[PDB]
Design a protein around this ligand. Sequence first.
Ligand SMILES: NC(=O)c1ccc[n+]([C@@H]2O[C@H](COP(=O)([O-])OP(=O)(O)OC[C@H]3O[C@@H](n4cnc5c(N)ncnc54)[C@H](O)[C@@H]3O)[C@@H](O)[C@H]2O)c1
Ligand SMILES: NC(=O)c1ccc[n+]([C@@H]2O[C@H](COP(=O)([O-])OP(=O)(O)OC[C@H]3O[C@@H](n4cnc5c(N)ncnc54)[C@H](O)[C@@H]3O)[C@@H](O)[C@H]2O)c1
Ligand SMILES: NC(=O)c1ccc[n+]([C@@H]2O[C@H](COP(=O)([O-])OP(=O)(O)OC[C@H]3O[C@@H](n4cnc5c(N)ncnc54)[C@H](O)[C@@H]3O)[C@@H](O)[C@H]2O)c1
Ligand SMILES: NC(=O)c1ccc[n+]([C@@H]2O[C@H](COP(=O)([O-])OP(=O)(O)OC[C@H]3O[C@@H](n4cnc5c(N)ncnc54)[C@H](O)[C@@H]3O)[C@@H](O)[C@H]2O)c1
Ligand SMILES: Nc1ncnc2c1ncn2[C@@H]1O[C@H](CO)C[C@H]1O
Ligand SMILES: [Cl-]
Ligand SMILES: [Cl-]
Ligand SMILES: [Cl-]
Ligand SMILES: [Cl-]
Ligand SMILES: [K+]
Ligand SMILES: [K+]
Ligand SMILES: [K+]
Ligand SMILES: [K+]
Lengths: 460, 460, 460, 460
Amino acid sequence: FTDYKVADITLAAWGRRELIIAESEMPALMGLRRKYAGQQPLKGAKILGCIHMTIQTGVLIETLVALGAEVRWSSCNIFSTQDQAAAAIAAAGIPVFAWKGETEEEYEWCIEQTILKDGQPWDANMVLDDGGDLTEILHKKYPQMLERIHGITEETTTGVHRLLDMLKNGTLKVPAINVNDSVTKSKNDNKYGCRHSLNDAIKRGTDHLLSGKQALVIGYGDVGKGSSQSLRQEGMIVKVAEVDPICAMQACMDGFEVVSPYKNGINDGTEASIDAALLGKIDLIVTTTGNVNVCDANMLKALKKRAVVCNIGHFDNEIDTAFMRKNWAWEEVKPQVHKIHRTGKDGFDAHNDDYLILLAEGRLVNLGNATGHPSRIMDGSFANQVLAQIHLFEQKYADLPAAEKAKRLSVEVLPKKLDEEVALEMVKGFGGVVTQLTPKQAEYIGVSVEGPFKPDTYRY
Amino acid sequence: FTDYKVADITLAAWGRRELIIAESEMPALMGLRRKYAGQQPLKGAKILGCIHMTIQTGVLIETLVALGAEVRWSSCNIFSTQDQAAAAIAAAGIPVFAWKGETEEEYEWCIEQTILKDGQPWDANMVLDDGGDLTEILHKKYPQMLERIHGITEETTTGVHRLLDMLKNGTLKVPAINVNDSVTKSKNDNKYGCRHSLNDAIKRGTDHLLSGKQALVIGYGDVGKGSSQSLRQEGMIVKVAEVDPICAMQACMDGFEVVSPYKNGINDGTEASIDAALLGKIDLIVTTTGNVNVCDANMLKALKKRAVVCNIGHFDNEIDTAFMRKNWAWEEVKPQVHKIHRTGKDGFDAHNDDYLILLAEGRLVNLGNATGHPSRIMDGSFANQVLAQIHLFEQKYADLPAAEKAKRLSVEVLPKKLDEEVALEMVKGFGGVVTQLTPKQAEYIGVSVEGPFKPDTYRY
Amino acid sequence: FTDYKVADITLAAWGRRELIIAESEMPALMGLRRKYAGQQPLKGAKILGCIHMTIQTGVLIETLVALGAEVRWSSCNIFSTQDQAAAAIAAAGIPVFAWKGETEEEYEWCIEQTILKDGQPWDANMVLDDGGDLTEILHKKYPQMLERIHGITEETTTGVHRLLDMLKNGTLKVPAINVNDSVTKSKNDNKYGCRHSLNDAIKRGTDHLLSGKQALVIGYGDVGKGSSQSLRQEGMIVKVAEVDPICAMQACMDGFEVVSPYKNGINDGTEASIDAALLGKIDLIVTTTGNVNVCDANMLKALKKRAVVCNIGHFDNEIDTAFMRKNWAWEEVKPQVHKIHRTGKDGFDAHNDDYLILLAEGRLVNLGNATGHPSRIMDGSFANQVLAQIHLFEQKYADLPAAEKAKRLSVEVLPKKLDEEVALEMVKGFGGVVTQLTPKQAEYIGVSVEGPFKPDTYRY
Amino acid sequence: FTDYKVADITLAAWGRRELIIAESEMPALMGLRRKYAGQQPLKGAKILGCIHMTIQTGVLIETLVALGAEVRWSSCNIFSTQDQAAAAIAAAGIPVFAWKGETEEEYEWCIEQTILKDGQPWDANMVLDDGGDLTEILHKKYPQMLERIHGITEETTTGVHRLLDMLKNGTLKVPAINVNDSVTKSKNDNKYGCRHSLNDAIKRGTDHLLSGKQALVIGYGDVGKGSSQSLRQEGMIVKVAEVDPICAMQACMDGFEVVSPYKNGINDGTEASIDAALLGKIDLIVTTTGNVNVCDANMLKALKKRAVVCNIGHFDNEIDTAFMRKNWAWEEVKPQVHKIHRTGKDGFDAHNDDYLILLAEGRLVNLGNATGHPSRIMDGSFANQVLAQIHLFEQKYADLPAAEKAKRLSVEVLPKKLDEEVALEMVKGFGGVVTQLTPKQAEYIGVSVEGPFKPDTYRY
Ligand SMILES: NC(=O)c1ccc[n+]([C@@H]2O[C@H](COP(=O)([O-])OP(=O)(O)OC[C@H]3O[C@@H](n4cnc5c(N)ncnc54)[C@H](O)[C@@H]3O)[C@@H](O)[C@H]2O)c1
Ligand SMILES: NC(=O)c1ccc[n+]([C@@H]2O[C@H](COP(=O)([O-])OP(=O)(O)OC[C@H]3O[C@@H](n4cnc5c(N)ncnc54)[C@H](O)[C@@H]3O)[C@@H](O)[C@H]2O)c1
Ligand SMILES: NC(=O)c1ccc[n+]([C@@H]2O[C@H](COP(=O)([O-])OP(=O)(O)OC[C@H]3O[C@@H](n4cnc5c(N)ncnc54)[C@H](O)[C@@H]3O)[C@@H](O)[C@H]2O)c1
Ligand SMILES: NC(=O)c1ccc[n+]([C@@H]2O[C@H](COP(=O)([O-])OP(=O)(O)OC[C@H]3O[C@@H](n4cnc5c(N)ncnc54)[C@H](O)[C@@H]3O)[C@@H](O)[C@H]2O)c1
Ligand SMILES: Nc1ncnc2c1ncn2[C@@H]1O[C@H](CO)C[C@H]1O
Ligand SMILES: [Cl-]
Ligand SMILES: [Cl-]
Ligand SMILES: [Cl-]
Ligand SMILES: [Cl-]
Ligand SMILES: [K+]
Ligand SMILES: [K+]
Ligand SMILES: [K+]
Ligand SMILES: [K+]
């Protein structure tokens, strides 16, 4: 077996030990293996996967394979692979093209190695994506392959936005499931995963004390909620920025001061608009938005000396790292940790005090500087992925006549009953005991004893 | 002026001082007063109101009046009135029939005094309700009045469930707005209000140390989330019960142990099914469900001696207080605080150690033993109420032709843009500064710079 | 029986019900009753007591009486009495002179009624004091009575400071025990009691939401630690001031921003030295120092409109309330809650926005606006009081010859073994289980299996 | 230069970059460098140092050298060295013998290389120790060297206990300073350091989600306080064991349930005495005691399958790892992470579910699996070390006449004024501003405006 490319195949046994531990931390996903292994619901599925090649993703891949699938895999970020996980998957005879510290050229080459087998398009019929890069390449470069693909299952709110833009423009070629919008994904992974992993990554990269220091979290959606908690629970003094007044209300009620980098919140592009007094007191800035240029050049210029700058949104463009590359000298401390010297670009002084510390070159910091979300949290997201793969594969969209395809071409979420079933396995993993409604109580609130327990409008 | 009934009109000046302070804590609601006072959008409205006669409700009532309405008011709970608030409203020449410590007969009489003026139905044309009791009485006993009513604005998730049952059965006679499902209601009031007011009520009633003691919170919806936090932040060791596995998942991730009162969660009605070991260690039980008999007779029998029992859901039927009335002796400590002696019903021993402490006779504890939610939280709920009253009044359902009425007979929520506008005023009240999107950023995420900022599916 | 003065003797039965509950919350104190009742170690003791006449103090008084003492009692603060507690004690035939809302003249008259019985000095032979006022009156006005007194047991760090000044000057006439410096007093009561009771008092007085608002806590000793936690756990954004860099270090590490009201910390008496920007953002100031004028006139002038001002240190002079009385108009909201109108002193405008809310007229806010510390915390302080009374009474200093008195005239703390025994009863009250050392383990760390477990230098 | 032994000298540049960052996080220690560099107070000092060879210790070493000292260094634990720190120190021409993953034989050899230079005793005249191993070797094996040594500065509460045993027995040969008992050491490092670094180490070793899982912390001294917080802030459900009722009282008040591994707390050595129900629910056990066999063989047998076991006390003997070595098979996952298979000793099944995960082979977990305490915390401990070295070096005990030596042979602490001065530099590092007392306020509380601010009895 040679149809793979990883950093170091001798890391496989270490990865396999970590996969075995992870399986014990992932009861929803393992439960699906056990439930469906007889049936082989993914027999004949040929899945192109593009998602962070971590130990958690290894358990996902091996679940899909245990259910009958074949796969070809790549990472969706240049710094997120755990090389022992990639090695263990390759050593199992699964095609994977992923290593920590890819260049952009290598990143694109890895996705292409999944798409092509022996120099020609693979017989793919399903896509599992995280962020939409693989989806975009297939639509732009490999439309013939999409003719034979039954569906896309997309992990991220960023990627879903990209799918919805395509649907609106009539350019989406295959149906999709929005995995993000399961409650056991968005209100588990996006929030509690970042709670676990943000402070982890900052400690691993810097070993800085966080207690007593000042942080600014840009955004207060699910990731910004989790991130703010990650830092506050360590004793940081956390301030929060938002454009959405409802999320800002939540931040206030949650005990944070809501501030803007700009005077009166007005971002008009001048240095004069920056709240220099505010930014000059910040020790750590974290972007969480999924938006562009939310930690901009003028903000970077105004930050307190020796501040840490990082991004936990999907794509690096949240921070103006291009400005920093053009203007300032980068001193690498160790992989994924750079001092950015604001003195200029013509070399640097190792003892200069006027620098910022950038983590993961602005790429997702939890995966870049640590190991991303823990297995017991990714259990929820990845159980949803498996259920979504099963649903779209069984629907067989590619084999439908044109008129029937037109009725099915949509971006949908999984039903609440399945979200509940995933949650129950997670709860049992903690040793939790859910109460069963009596028939009188189920009648009283208007639900089945089996669920679903909430209307689709419920926000949790 | 004599068209009122309150405990003590001499409390009015104290109430008025507290209304003036509350106005300073309610910027959304005060902002609506300022914005709409010229236009008089509620000129000609005649509103029957049934909601807890607190200081916060006084600010609501006076906003409605300032916008042009006439009202006739009662409380929706026998213990929730603040007598100084009722007095201040009556002293202002507004019909109010409410006092703390009503009997059930008096409660019904008060609602009837709003409905009848001078012994005949008042020419009401709007309803503001909290829990659905007024709505039910109008449908059952005064259906002719509904022929002239343009709509109902309902505060509570309980009352909305009741309205949806009526709609489904074809018995709802006028359209309604579900105020609860604004984010600035459900994810503000239900959660943060109970966070503020649950520990407040327990301290006022008992003066018990909470730190280091064991609590069981039944339910983990919005009220159970806020309640659990109210107790955990004081240092309680909190366990959480749930029937909904998604809510139970949240509780686990939030750092609580998820337990059932019943062995393996099976509530089969025998004493043998009670987890006596668990209940024998609990110092405080709080019900949050909106369901029936979630703290049942067998649970009450198994609780640790001297445990506190209370309910923060809308109706008292969450706890089997009828069982306690039939079997055990009640020693009143002070109003809304009773020791329930498990020794029997034939008198009590003042020094008996085998008792429970019941707060507010099992009625909503925050309002019964304290003052309910604080003004700055109720600002959100009550701004929504005013917007909802304006919308339904302006739509004039009662005046529509039959075919037009058929198209508008619905239970609806307010638009997200208005939810956002309420939130923004709340945030400004904390001194928060919301950032404005640049045109490029608004394009990038697919929103208007003015909002709304999220799709209707977003859960916050 | 007529040898008492209370607000309303008909409150006795309510007080007695609350005493019975409190006994169930005070296992250390009740354990001393049970242990020593046979022996009657306080038979012949005649105790002048001056400490907050709360339910908790009632349990203390009745323990002393159960052990053989007779007492005459007063409160040590004009606003701290719970009138039902005072009534219950009077109804039991115990001389008590205390009510909530005394004037200064009445306060002094009440202490004098304890000292004098039937117009002549009582046959006192012990003193229990909280803050040193009774101790001072005896030394200045009744030195003949001190000849027959065996000792003073003093609750407070303020009062201990006053005792140590007297000892140093050679004016202390009888020995004392510093009850404060038991760990089960200072590191229980001073910290966790204020954690429980500060937010309680502010809610009762104002009903303000605390979450999301800005607080300044002046001091970070035991009370400032507890107070800061009381507010932070509610979601306040808390800043801390200190003069002691070690306590300030603790505040930083605990996750607070450490600030001064004065520019660069320099308090030189001018308006120019005030950090107006800082004070203009503060919603709540709490003094915790035991020092003088730590919330001074210039600070008061600079506070944000509608800020709440309160003091939880023993004496009101922490806040310059005299300045406010001389310059600004006081609008009483309700007892212990005043709006202080910064517009001037010539009447007030009920709708003026430029006011501060002062709680308890600057007197200890927890006792003034709520009920002070909870029974389960006061159990520790008051068990120490009883042990201290027993020790000094048994030593019989007054009966010693002059040369022997000279050897015993000291201010001392209780031995660690007794502090440990109190703590063990508290722990058992929570259902806690302490592990017993094996003989090998006790040898390994150099302690007895029975304790004491730490050297006297240990700080906990 | 060849007088060193490290893992990899090519790591030096990386170490030096991390030292430069650490200097920016250590203002107290850097401030001492600046203050004393002119004076060279350690000119002629020849310091044998034995303390964890981390980046933080590198800043300490280079401060000592900057003040005039020569040193010879080793680590005090086999797993605590950061190889890049050791390399940087060796590359600077400083003798260091330390690497991560020493054997016990290598550990002893490294200490011997500090003691011997060119095969003969070095002319050492000062000792800096952490845990007492170097001190013991000098007293037992090299007593002639102690004739020329002016003093020992000891980091740890374990090592101080060892010094006090020697003093009591008349076997201590040179005076010592107890560095641990500075408040800026014990109530900074022991508490907040473990708060930072315990959860860090567990995440690095296992990548386990902690939220929602059950932990047992054995001990509630400074390390157990910080450790419990490290876990609770992540959402663990933490129970605490203690032998000291005062520490157990604190745990209850801090919101933890206090439990014993043994039924009724009685550790009589039989399996029957183990509370199997309790231990069978524990996911993580952490020992913090400084005692022996506090996680014993019978406890290990009863723990829930797949529990994590670790120790953060100074020595590994807290956990019965010898029992595990004799009876159970060890599967290495990666360095400092072993699965201990309870199935037996004859090989292991890679898929066995009945194992425990042991971190750092039971040695101090924060240093073994992460990087120990962060620089900004170690600044306090290490500033104290430098002050202590200066004091004892300047006192010149070895040169004193016999009668003079007898008066100075003691174990002492640094003065409070110096503790305060360290704290002040720490506070300024956070941007904190300490208030200066006015003359009137200093008089009122009986202190100098310059401090010290508290009596020596104050516990903070
Ligand atoms: N690193 C991880 O493991 C991880 C985990 C989950 C999600 N994500 C990624 O994080 C991003 C955010 O995801 P989410 O679920 O929080 O989305 P979300 O929509 O819940 O929240 C994003 C928030 O950013 C706010 N925002 C937008 N522009 C802003 C600006 N200029 N200033 C301040 N606030 C602004 C929005 O109002 C919104 O509330 C996405 O790219 C998502 O894919 C990363
Ligand atoms: N006292 C107050 O001020 C206040 C504030 C807001 C809402 N409320 C009332 O509180 C109630 C709950 O409101 P909410 O917004 O939390 O509703 P919700 O639907 O968000 O939550 C109720 C929860 O109870 C759970 N539940 C139902 N039966 C259960 C059982 N037998 N055991 C355990 N859990 C069970 C459900 O699964 C659900 O998650 C309603 O009656 C509402 O009107 C009171
Ligand atoms: N209300 C209550 O129930 C209650 C409970 C316990 C103690 N107390 C009282 O509270 C007071 C404080 O007691 P404590 O045990 O915290 O004493 P403490 O000595 O532990 O702490 C007082 C703190 O105030 C600081 N301080 C002094 N002057 C200051 C200034 N100008 N600015 C800022 N900080 C300053 C000191 O450095 C010290 O750390 C005493 O009067 C005590 O009797 C009240
Ligand atoms: N890993 C680190 O970085 C680090 C940091 C500081 C201290 N330490 C070490 O940690 C240890 C503890 O230090 P500390 O400052 O907390 O000491 P401490 O004396 O403050 O606390 C130890 C606690 O253990 C308790 N204890 C003793 N035997 C027990 C038993 N059988 N069961 C339960 N509790 C028991 C004691 O009562 C005491 O309260 C020492 O070995 C110290 O050197 C390690
Ligand atoms: N202070 C207060 N005034 C009026 N309504 C309140 C209140 N506190 C809680 N409520 C409302 O009471 C509802 C339940 O009947 C939930 C909440 O909207
Ligand atoms: Cl996402
Ligand atoms: Cl509701
Ligand atoms: Cl005190
Ligand atoms: Cl130590
Ligand atoms: K991970
Ligand atoms: K209220
Ligand atoms: K009390
Ligand atoms: K470190």
